[PDB]
Symmetry: C3
Subunit: 95 residues, 3 copies
Amino acid sequence: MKKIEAIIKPFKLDEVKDALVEIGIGGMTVTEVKGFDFLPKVKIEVVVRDEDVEKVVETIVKTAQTGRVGDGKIFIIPVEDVIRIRTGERGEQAI
Amino acid sequence: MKKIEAIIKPFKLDEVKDALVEIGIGGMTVTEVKGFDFLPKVKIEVVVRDEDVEKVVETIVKTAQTGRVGDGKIFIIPVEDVIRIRTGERGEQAI
Amino acid sequence: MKKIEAIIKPFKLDEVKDALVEIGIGGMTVTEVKGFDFLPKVKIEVVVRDEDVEKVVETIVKTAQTGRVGDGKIFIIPVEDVIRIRTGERGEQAI
Ligand SMILES: Nc1ncnc2c1ncn2[C@@H]1O[C@H](COP(=O)(O)OP(=O)(O)OP(=O)(O)O)[C@@H](O)[C@H]1O
Ligand SMILES: Nc1ncnc2c1ncn2[C@@H]1O[C@H](COP(=O)(O)OP(=O)(O)OP(=O)(O)O)[C@@H](O)[C@H]1O
Ligand SMILES: Nc1ncnc2c1ncn2[C@@H]1O[C@H](COP(=O)(O)OP(=O)(O)OP(=O)(O)O)[C@@H](O)[C@H]1O
Ligand SMILES: [Cl-]
């Protein structure tokens, strides 16, 4: 499993969220942040199975891209376990 | 060492914080976030020794759980080093 | 590549940002958070090449340190890939 953390322009959030839901993303966490003299940005975090990482990365790139400076970056971070709070399910059963 | 990132319902924050302090957690970072059409959630991050991860996970699950949809998830992420800013202490000496 | 996540006192943000830019940091993401009964803190995230991690850690420690309790902590988290949204560049080409 991997955590995909993407920092994008705020106005791109609904489009990116819609695109991710469309390819099957079940959950996502959004944080208001600032970055680069700081400009507002939106952080999106999604945790997915290893075999789904590339599709998510390409979907975020294609949907959040404007071609202008400041479009943002995506970081792929390893996740060793995932636990669903409601049920105690883990790993594959919790994504 | 591992970072435990948990996304929980906002009203569960004081209970979860109290439960974590009770089992010995020295520090925690809380961020206001939104998730799933987005609903407010609270992100808690705690970095702990490998041998303390399971106790923290079980404590968050038991305290944040309501049995209803939206209870949240917990992600376990590897941390290669930890540094205490005040002293420069690292690793085991900084947790 | 590694993600350096530092939680610091809010008033230290401009100094730390200036110090990081000075040693060559191209980008950084800042989040308003609370921590420890919670006090406001600022989270800074920077993703850098492995050979630049120590310089960044020392720069944050030296600039954010006051010697008083609450100065904060720095976590070093592995990053498996980085993607520049504007161009699709990855890894070394995206930092
Ligand atoms: N190295 C980094 N570490 C942490 N956060 C970063 C880093 N680089 C970028 N970010 C985050 O991504 C946001 C958008 O950055 P940005 O789109 O400018 O990337 P870039 O390297 O400048 O490529 P571009 O030429 O398209 O601007 C930054 O404001 C910051 O929030
Ligand atoms: N895959 C994910 N990636 C990133 N964040 C997630 C992911 N899944 C859940 N979250 C975060 O956890 C929050 C709560 O999710 P939630 O409790 O609905 O998990 P779930 O999979 O729906 O299980 P449940 O059936 O109990 O709802 C979401 O709003 C989001 O902020
Ligand atoms: N173990 C931890 N897990 C997650 N976040 C932490 C942890 N420890 C500290 N933090 C974050 O760092 C912030 C500042 O902590 P702090 O400076 O008090 O570290 P410390 O261990 O108490 O060392 P000091 O004696 O200098 O206070 C905390 O408020 C919290 O936001
Ligand atoms: Cl992380």
